[PDB]
């Protein structure tokens with residue numbers, strides 16, 4: 001029996017909670033309410049960060065999911081799918097599911113942070129005179145009221161202030177004209193202020209939200225490009241599609257495009273890349289030519305070399321302000337299911353009519369594949385023949401992508417067909433369909449069937465439907481959780497089918513024989529949501545980790561993935577003011593709290609903790625032999641952390657990680673940087689490198705102190721350190 005500790009609970013909303021999602025970089029829980037709003041809560045102190053409505057249609061069923069492999073958040077409604085990511089430590093969730101407009105006069109929602117809005121207001125009131133521009137008074141008044149509402153919350157909590165964004169409701173063409181006027185007015189005065197890149201990013205986001213204001217990229221000889229259209233980084237890196245030197249080490253499109261260069265070739269096959277700010281003539285590129293060093297040498301007066309603020313638009317701002325594309329061009333079909341698998345770089349979306357669109361959300365948001373599933377495939381036909389005019393209706397209920405060898409799409413389909421009774425009866429059968437993803441550069445064509453896996457007899461007998469598909473942490477096994485499909489005896493709670501992936505051929509396939517079948521004989525224990533726990537947390541036939549599932553009645557079950565035996569049981573809490581069951585609906589894992597965070601029926605959040613000195617052979621009492629001292633010395637070495645950790649800084653610092661400080665006196669007295677490791681392991685040390693001012697004539701009395709971040713509740717030192725003096729772990733130095 002495994003021990004689970006309960007140390008309290010928190011109240012998020014009184015409207016209830018349905019699904020949960022956790023962002024590991026910002027330690028933020030994105031709880032999904034039953035009314036469609038997304039409530040972002042911090043995971044370090046219990047103080048809620050923000051609330052969002054995603055600018056979607058009212059009454060829509062918002063479903064939010066997170067991917068840590070690509071570090072992107074997917075929001076799926078009944079209409080469209082939106083992709084978001086972190087931007088300067090906050091998530092721009094106000095316009096996450098914004099439908100792209102078709103005309104210039106449509107009112108668009110423009111969400112902006114606090115420092116950007118303050119710089120825009122300071123420029124418009126001090127350095128920029130744009131009173132002749134259309135819509136100037138409305139934008140000025142909206143900026144003023146947004147800043148005057150934000151400044152009250154600014155002095156209370158810094159993280160809630162940074163998460164708070166001002167949403168302007170203005171027409172698209174008016175905002176575009178205002179931003180163009182700001183860019184021109186700041187360009188004619190030759191002043192390098194912070195409002196210029198803000199306005200450039202704003203106008204690039206507005207141009208990206210409207211496909212009608214996106215002219216075609218005219219990359220060709222004898223034709224100049226539009227520099228104002230080339231202010232975006234994505235267009236500059238798109239211009240290198242015909243680059244003949246992709247195989248070069250440093251002359252690659254992605255590292256060389258971010259320096260502010262675009263391909264303007266005079267012929268077909270050359271390497272002429274011009275800057276979009278200083279217009280430096282560069283030819284005969286070399287594989288050893290570092291882009292930053294070449295831009296510094298050939299143009300030291302370029303503001304990118306000095307780091308000054310230009311009209312550049314970073315790709316992170318465009319990705320954080322990307323629109324929500326519909327799975328079809330008609331935009332009227334409703335999405336039945338979504339998800340991600342062992343290759344989550346591509347995002348799949350299937351409609352109820354049988355059309356699947358796959359987007360490359362890992363790269364820039366574009367159309368990657370679009371096809372329609374035909375239910376009358378020969379493999380489906382012969383599987384239905386082996387099961388027993390001809391009418392077949394196929395509906396997808398789960399989506400996954402499996403990869404070890406190009407990736408393939410796994411769709412969990414349900415086939416309903418009229419069969420004679422041995423009057424016609426509509427029988428349902430769940431199957432798995434494999435479709436090709438990667439296009440051709442006799443291999444199968446994309447959009448065609450690869451493997452038609454047939455589920456065993458109990459799925460057809462009980463009319464079960466494929467509820468969830470999840471690849472295991474090993475990468476060699478796959479789990480399918482079923483449930484009773486409602487119709488428009490002994491009721492079962494579903495089945496857990498563990499399959500083995502097949503990599504015998506060049507295409508990712510599965511095996512017909514299931515490697516494990518587990519039954520849920522209790523109808524009350526119907527599986528609603530699942531999560532997988534990494535085994536290294538327990539390190540503080542090989543075992544395949546632990547699986548945490550939520551039931552219909554709210555009983556959280558933690559089971560070993562090898563045999564699906566009930567190891568840990570968590571009863572649902574009781575509602576306040578009564579004896580009703582506050583049944584758990586969804587569960588996620590919070591790394592910052594190191595706890596299972598589960599949402600209740602009443603909207604509460606509960607954190608469950610997993611896990612709970614003599615008799616050791618020490619390394620001291622032994623005699624001083626050579627091997628023991630050698631093992632002690634080999635123990636005391638240090639290694640570099642890989643991959644990248646997580647960290648956030650105050651916005652006065654702009655960007656193994658480095659930053660540059662800007663002269664801001666709003667919070668000059670204190671600076672708090674937060675660090676979250678990707679995994680709790682053996683802490684060696686932290687290296688803190690600094691470069692000071694060149695005009696320093698006196699030794700500064702400035703101290704840096706490391707502190708253990710406190711877990712949230714479920715000569716005299718500085719007062720902030722006095723507040724956390726007991727839990728200190730380094731310094732003062």
Ligand SMILES: [Zn+2]
Nearest residue numbers: 275278299302
């Ligand atoms: Zn330049």
